[PDB]
Design a protein around this ligand. Structure first.
Ligand SMILES: [Mg+2]
Ligand SMILES: [Mg+2]
Ligand SMILES: [Zn+2]
Ligand SMILES: [Zn+2]
Ligand SMILES: [Zn+2]
Ligand SMILES: [Zn+2]
Lengths: 441, 441
């Protein structure tokens, strides 16, 4: 437990530590190989996002049972590259950062699974599958979005979701030009044991060449032996996932609906509007599985493989709500990731042979600022679990979408080989860390 | 070494790790007590400040040989309390935050060395001295400013620098009303072996009561045996510091001059003005010692005490230049702090019995955002060590000064008891860690 231990008005009362940690940390250091690796990504979940979500949902002196309970912690860098010159670009997008940890190569903003020369590099999922490990790719975004797509697709622009855009924007990747295909075509070739998220929209496009030309991508997936589930009940009813019968979960046309709702932040919103209590998203239905449900089911089905498994889990809309200057949307998706981390840690503690890693692809806009601030951007006051007011601020864009930020951010881990996230590391180290933990050549 | 290992455009080339760190970290976990503690504080130096300075002066794949070199890393929370309600205040000031790590109790914004009931608590420096340890307090700020003051003074408001203001703003602390005195009077009573910094102006005020009534505080300090020095030559000439001959360095009227200058960030500054190259401060005379030179001399003199020592060093003007939306001033003082951390780590590695800690009191406003951003606040484009353009942004205040921010931020450590900074901790845990490290009761 790392909650405040007592009365925070008294000496010692706000300590998170009960005593010396050296021996416990010593025991947390395990050099043996990992049998399984679970990587959980909060898109845009920098330290500010964690801190704001903790303050709101757990209180300042509270504790995230998942996100905050991983004992080995460091900071890593996620800068990308300018495509033409190869020099650093200090603020990455989602595609170049995912490429970094899935392949170990830096690349340009928007690239998926290729380097600045447009050369494809093998991903951690492809390597694990080549060694006979089971593989899983779970997200609350559309499955074609950068973060899950990077594990399975190699294209020159993250926009190349299906055949139609790929033909126009990634012509060397287009199937009718001899390429590997759109992101969705390449997903279906990669064939993870378990693929769960949104993005049904693109599966109604039809292939332009190949053995399944004329068919919709959904028809292709059906014909190639995928079992398709579409809601929480059908997901719960799945009992196996394998290369013979891979599980594909398509739970929404686009991204799946976020959990919480609130007003967008506004100019002088902390001043001229009352404090906010987050409420449920009315678009959110219980027929749609939560991130925790798909994480627990993925772990269940992947753990039947005797050689072990690799699973990536993305809480994807932390970032997208941060872009839209919506603190309630953003915080809710961070609470949502915490519930998934809890599922991974619960499995990993009883298993004893699982490396769990929790981090973000890059940092984002939101800032915690004083309640009486007069700021030039969008702000909002929130009623927290402490019974106090917190103000969040989005101050780095005058356009519709807030910007990513370049700050280094927390990476945390539990289990074998977790020591390799401590100190200052780079996002491309994370690839090598998971390759080595799983003993992959 | 944690710089990128090779050509950042190639696979593996941006990695900061050369191999598995499990065994190396296990060796870094030391359980024995510490003989000495060096705490280095970057005022306002959150993860964003660290990253921006590294990008600028070392390159994105570079490595701060001090700041980035400490192997045990965590994130800690620094929220303060509302004075009336005792609930969390999610964005602290310098005074409450310093009180937290110097006394182990949370307090209200503006308080020094007292709790929300205005009652005093003993500091790590007072406890060290009482146990027989040598003590030192070094800052580039006025010695009356919140960060150094917290080690030696207990006053209901940080404004109470000298007698004049204490009588008006802190009447219960004023000497003539039976209090323990202004910050400067309490400093002289506290009598560290080594106190170095700015703030000579307040020493020209005269005490209103006491044994030194009618004398200036500078006159009082001479009368009580302090050895006063005022430039680099007189500092380097000092051969010892003790309770019989405590060393008092007053190197500036107010704050010590910053190392670097540049233009203030401005509205659309990254669009409408060319990128900036920071230049050294032309007003900074060579006779003014640097933070690194004060640090090394403090260690030299404090290490003569066989029982051990406690030393706090602050790079104070990171925060001040952050407030002023001045990236060059801000980055210069981070580079400055890195040189002082090098001095501490070089001593600590040969000594073997020294805990070194590097962190901040709270986070700040500056963000790294995309080069082509159109932001509502103040921005600036900078030419970096990489030959690429960085943009920094101050978007959280329309007032004359930018606001602190509430995000958790990095704490890193080296040497005995350093494991107690790993994971999620609280700023008040740092007090306990330092206290336990030194076996203080
Ligand atoms: Mg994403
Ligand atoms: Mg300070
Ligand atoms: Zn992203
Ligand atoms: Zn984004
Ligand atoms: Zn401060
Ligand atoms: Zn400040």
């Amino acid at each position: 437990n790392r909650a405040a231990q007592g009365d925070i008005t008294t000496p010692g009362g706000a300590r998170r530590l009960t005593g010396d940690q050296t021996e416990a940390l010593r025991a947390s250091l395990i050099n043996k190989p990992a049998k399984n690796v679970i990587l959980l990504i909060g898109d845009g979940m920098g330290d500010s996002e964690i801190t704001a979500a903790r303050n709101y949902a757990e209180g300042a002196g509270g504790f995230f049972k998942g996100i905050d309970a991983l004992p080995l912690t460091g900071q890593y860098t996620h800068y990308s590259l300018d495509k033409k010159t190869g020099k650093p670009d200090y603020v990455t997008d989602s595609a170049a950062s995912a490429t970094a940890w899935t392949t170990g190569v830096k690349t340009y903003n928007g690239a998926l699974g290729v380097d600045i020369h447009e050369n494809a590099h093998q991903t951690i999922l492809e390597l694990a599958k080549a060694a006979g490990l089971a593989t899983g790719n779970v997200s609350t975004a559309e499955l074609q979005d950068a973060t899950p797509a990077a594990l399975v697709a190699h294209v020159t622009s993250r926009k190349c979701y299906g055949p139609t855009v790929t033909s126009e924007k990634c012509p060397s990747n287009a199937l009718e030009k001899g390429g590997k295909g759109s992101i969705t075509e390449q997903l279906l070739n990669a064939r993870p044991d378990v693929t769960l998220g949104g993005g049904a929209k693109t599966f109604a496009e039809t292939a332009t060449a190949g053995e399944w030309q004329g068919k919709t991508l959904r028809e292709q997936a059906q014909a190639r032996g995928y079992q398709i589930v579409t809601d929480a009940a059908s997901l719960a009813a799945a009992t196996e996932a394998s290369q013979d019968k891979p599980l594909l979960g398509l739970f929404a046309d686009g991204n799946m609906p976020v959990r919480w709702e609130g007003p967008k932040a506004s100019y002088h919103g902390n001043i001229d509007k009352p404090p906010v209590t987050c409420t449920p998203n009315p678009k959110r239905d219980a027929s749609v599985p939560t991130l925790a449900q798909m994480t627990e089911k993925a772990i269940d089905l992947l753990s039947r493989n005797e050689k072990g498994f690799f699973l990536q889990v993305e809480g994807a809309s932390i970032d997208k709500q941060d872009h839209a200057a919506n603190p309630c949307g953003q915080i809710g998706e961070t609470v949502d990731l915490d519930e998934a981390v809890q599922k991974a840690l619960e499995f990993a503690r009883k298993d004893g042979n699982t490396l769990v890693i929790v981090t973000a692809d890059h940092a984002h806009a939101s800032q915690i600022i004083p309640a009486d601030s007069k700021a030039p951007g969008l702000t909002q006051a929130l009623n927290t679990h402490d019974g106090a007011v917190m103000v969040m601020s989005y101050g780095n864009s005058e356009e519709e979408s807030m910007e990513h930020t370049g700050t280094q951010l927390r990476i945390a881990a539990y289990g074998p080989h977790a020591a390799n996230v401590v100190g200052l590391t780079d996002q491309t180290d994370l690839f090598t860390t998971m390759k080595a933990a799983l003993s992959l050549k």
